[PDB]
């Protein structure tokens, strides 16, 4: 479990910082999207969001993230179907909030361990 956190952390940090550098004027969504814990890390609550933004992001990093989180998922656990905002500004806020909360979850879980 510490192993998956450490594998994911550079991927998450890079995705967030690259978005902060490339995207200008992204509004605050004020939404909670990712549920960090279940109490173990909550792959089934986090995974659908990454599946939903895969076409909008770096598919290669996303695929690595998904492969890591799949290892922390019960096969029986169902995944919510995610609604990605269609409006361009809402869609960037949606992506940005996912990256922020994923970063925060891993940092939180790491302090736990």
């Amino acid at each position: 479990v510490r192993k998956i956190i450490l594998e994911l952390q550079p991927l998450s940090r890079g995705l967030l910082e690259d978005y902060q550098k490339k995207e200008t004027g992204v509004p605050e969504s004020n939404r909670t999207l990712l549920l960090c814990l279940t109490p173990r890390l909550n792959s089934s609550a986090i995974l659908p969001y990454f599946r939903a933004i895969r076409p909008l992001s770096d598919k290669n990093i996303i695929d690595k993230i998904i492969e890591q989180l799949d290892k922390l998922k019960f096969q029986h656990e169902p995944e919510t179907e995610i609604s990605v905002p269609a409006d361009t500004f809402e869609c960037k806020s949606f992506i940005l909030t996912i990256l922020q909360q994923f970063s925060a979850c891993l940092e939180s879980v790491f302090k736990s361990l």
């Epitope: 940090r13 967030l16 910082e17 550098k21 200008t24 925060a104």
Partner: antibody
Framework: EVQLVESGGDLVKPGGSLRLSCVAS????????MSWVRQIPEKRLEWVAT????????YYVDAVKGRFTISRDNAKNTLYLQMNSLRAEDTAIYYC????????????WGQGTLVTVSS | EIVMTQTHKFMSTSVGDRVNITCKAS??????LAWYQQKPGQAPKLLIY???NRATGVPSRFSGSGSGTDFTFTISSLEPEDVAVYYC????????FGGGTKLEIKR
């Protein structure tokens, strides 16, 4: 509630140095871009510097490049402005601010810390 | 570097009047403009972003319009607590602020 509290402003002579700190509470500090904005006595606002979540990217306004250094310590929820080779026109209230990406607007401001540079 | 020009340093208004504050950018910034209000002894407060989105809790008498290079900040009916300095700011590229427009009461 989101809170930013600046400290470290003081009087200094031209060519001196000073270190500003901003301690943040009420949000996950490492999730956000952080920035400094200053306001000179004539009340013009000037953006100063910006740092991404984990320090990989920084931008500086030309007036302070090669003299000021922005940095952050995520463990301590603290943003820093290291100010070297200070000049009189650096005299200003320095505000700590939070942003979503590196080029954006400033929705959260601290109360400011006054820096006075004078011979 | 994108220069933001607020032509009027000061404007006289009367309570109950419409106020139009103008800001022009030296190059196209699209809608990537923000408006701030500042009262003495306080930090600036965000009012409008993306030229016309009113930030949370901002009174409905405040509004912004424009896209491109010419922007207008509008108070539909000035209230006494609205006496302040208003600044525009572009975030199309590296941050720059207009020089401020102080509202004062005509008598």
């Amino acid at each position: 509630e989101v809170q930013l509290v600046e400290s470290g402003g003081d009087l200094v002579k031209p060519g001196g140095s000073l270190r500003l700190s901003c301690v943040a509470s009420g949000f996950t500090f490492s999730s956000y871009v952080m920035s400094w904005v200053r306001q000179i006595p004539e009340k013009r606002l000037e953006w100063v510097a910006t740092i991404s979540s984990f320090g990989s990217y920084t931008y500086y306004v030309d007036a302070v490049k090669g003299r000021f250094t922005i940095s952050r310590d995520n463990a301590k929820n603290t943003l820093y402005l290291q100010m070297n080779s200070l000049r009189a026109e650096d005299t200003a209230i320095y505000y700590c601010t939070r942003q979503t990406t590196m080029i954006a607007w400033f929705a959260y401001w601290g109360q400011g810390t006054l820096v006075t540079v004078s011979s | 570097e994108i220069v933001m020009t607020q032509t009027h340093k000061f404007m006289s208004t009367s309570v109950g009047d419409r106020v139009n504050i103008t800001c022009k950018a030296s190059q196209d910034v699209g809608a990537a403009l923000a408006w701030y209000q500042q009262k003495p002894g306080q930090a600036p407060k965000l009012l409008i972003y993306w030229a016309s989105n009113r930030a949370t809790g901002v009174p409905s008498r405040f509004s912004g319009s424009g896209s491109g290079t010419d922007f207008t900040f509008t108070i539909s009916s000035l209230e006494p607590e609205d006496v302040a300095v208003y600044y525009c700011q572009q975030f199309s590229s590296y941050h720059t602020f207009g020089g401020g427009t102080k509202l004062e009461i005509k008598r």
